């Protein structure tokens, strides 16, 4: 029953590969259904066309800011932001999909894909999904990142939606 969605990544317009995720709607429903609805585009905005503004090798790839494309805003499906669902799931390793907030209870549309164990984020960031396939795509676009998160190339979500 756990939704599966995907991202078709491209490096400067040129298609890179597909990355799919399993969303734990059974544990984190509002948070999962938020990501799910934004991956497809069930409301007119969403992750399509948006990019990964912040990428730090060995840490994570952050995207989701479809409105500002910098990390300032972006927005969920419930107006603007919403509270933390819970912290049941932990940042166990690469592939982990977590919400990128700006202080407790400010989950909007932004998220990050882990490329390493980041347990220090446990309790601060809501873990709601994980890459199922395409961890080598996430890793390929990671090299186009940096220390401060600036991307040396324009990594975009060329396409996205729900496979089940």
């Amino acid at each position: 029953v756990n939704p599966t969605v995907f991202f078709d990544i491209a490096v400067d317009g040129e298609p890179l590969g597909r990355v799919s995720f399993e969303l734990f709607a059974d544990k984190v429903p509002k948070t999962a259904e938020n990501f799910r609805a934004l991956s497809t585009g069930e409301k007119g905005f969403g992750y399509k066309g948006s990019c990964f503004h912040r990428i730090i090798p060995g840490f994570m790839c952050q995207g989701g800011d479809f409105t500002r494309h910098n990390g300032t805003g972006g927005k969920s499906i419930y107006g603007e932001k919403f509270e933390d669902e819970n912290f049941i799931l932990k940042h166990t390793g690469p592939g982990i999909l977590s919400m990128a907030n700006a202080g407790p209870n400010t989950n909007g549309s932004q998220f990050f894909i882990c490329t390493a164990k980041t347990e220090w984020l446990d309790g601060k960031h809501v873990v709601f999904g994980k890459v199922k396939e395409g961890m080598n795509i996430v890793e390929a676009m990671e090299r186009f990142g940096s220390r401060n998160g600036k991307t040396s190339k324009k990594i975009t979500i060329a396409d996205c939606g729900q496979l089940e």
Binding site: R54, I56, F59, M60, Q62, D65, N70, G71, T72, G74, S98, A100, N101, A102, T106, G108, Q110, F112, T118, W120, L121, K124, H125, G149
Partner: peptide, 6 residues
């Protein structure tokens, strides 16, 4: 500004 830090 949103995002996790190391």
């Amino acid at each position: 500004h949103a995002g996790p830090i190391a």
